Symmetry: D2
Subunit: 121 residues, 4 copies
């Protein structure tokens, strides 16, 4: 009944939006981009610490081609595909030392319906 | 659809074990101790950073009477009641610069049954 | 390394907004109301199932004096104090078979600052 | 400040173990299997409802080739690769109307170290 450092690290997860698997806009995405989104999402709290917050309170990223390279553990060929994929679906904004804005996904009445079916018997 | 620092801080919660509200051992506890447990639980990740990990990997706390005083925002009269309450139910171990070990709660077939009833219509 | 039903019920928590412990508007609240908020918050998913969703997509509650009585495990004397307390701080709306609207808390630059101090060394 | 059904479905995630991206045993896994693990993990609560709990309290799955086919949205060719991949790393047990046991991942001192580096600046 002790809290262990091992059980603690075993309970750390990246968060994959379930809508990535019901919404036609998103389902299309390569798993590399879906997972990339989840990994970047986890960094939001960091950005707040790095004070990467704009004038309106929006949280952004300042990552080079190499940063994302280590962060997502993939080559610049792949990350190029990743960014382009996420932007095409309005999941990312590169408002050009680049600035990246992660965006939350959209939800539709159908997503809801589907997400229910996906979460039940 | 931007992630905001405000929405981010608005989505930060202390975790209250639901079993604190079904198990007779725990229900008895004062809300001050239940909440105190939740607050301390949130500190586990800190302790790992402070390398407050024993030889077997268990995570502990090194908090003075004043630390807990600010951490739980209450007087030493109350925290005394808090510790004694949590220890009485094996939710805390003071293995005497004090060392505190938070413990996870117990679960019984009835807790499960009750927790189901509590989570449903 | 098996997932057990016991470990699963042991990892179920009510979510206590941390801002309830930094914002002056909220700190004032009795622990009964803070916890009551957390308990009710957990019911949101139920309401969606009961189709307790208004025209604008807002999620509400249809609970009698007895429902809340069992749900929060307390007497009608206490729940009266609870509702009045939560409404006074805009955490609840009783738009009178009653309808209850839970509301999310507010966040201020100070809450953020405080919440940082509360989450760190 | 209302809780909306849309914001509620927008905040639903599958949980990707971060160790899948630090431990050599796991990193190797195809994204299809990593995500498949996350999707199946989400079903644990269902299994409890279906009373898919063995004598020792372990939670299991009773899924046909078609069930997993719809659940993971992929062909039987892919799921074959998925199961074989997860079993090879002790993340799944097919104790043959099949029975599937999801297993939690392992953690090492290095995983911890890596997971820290992955979660920080």
């Amino acid at each position: 009944q002790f809290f262990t450092v091992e059980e603690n690290y075993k309970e750390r997860f990246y968060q994959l939006p379930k809508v990535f698997f019901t919404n036609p806009n998103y389902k299309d995405l390569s798993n590399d981009a879906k997972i990339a989104y989840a990994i970047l999402r986890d960094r939001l709290q960091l950005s707040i610490k790095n004070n990467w917050i704009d004038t309106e309170g929006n949280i952004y990223f300042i990552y080079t081609v190499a940063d994302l390279e280590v962060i997502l553990n993939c080559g610049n060929k792949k990350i190029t595909k990743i960014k382009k994929e996420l932007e095409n679906v309005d999941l990312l904004i590169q408002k050009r030392p680049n600035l990246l804005y992660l965006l939350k996904p959209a939800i539709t009445k159908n997503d809801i319906y589907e997400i229910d079916k996906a979460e039940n018997e």
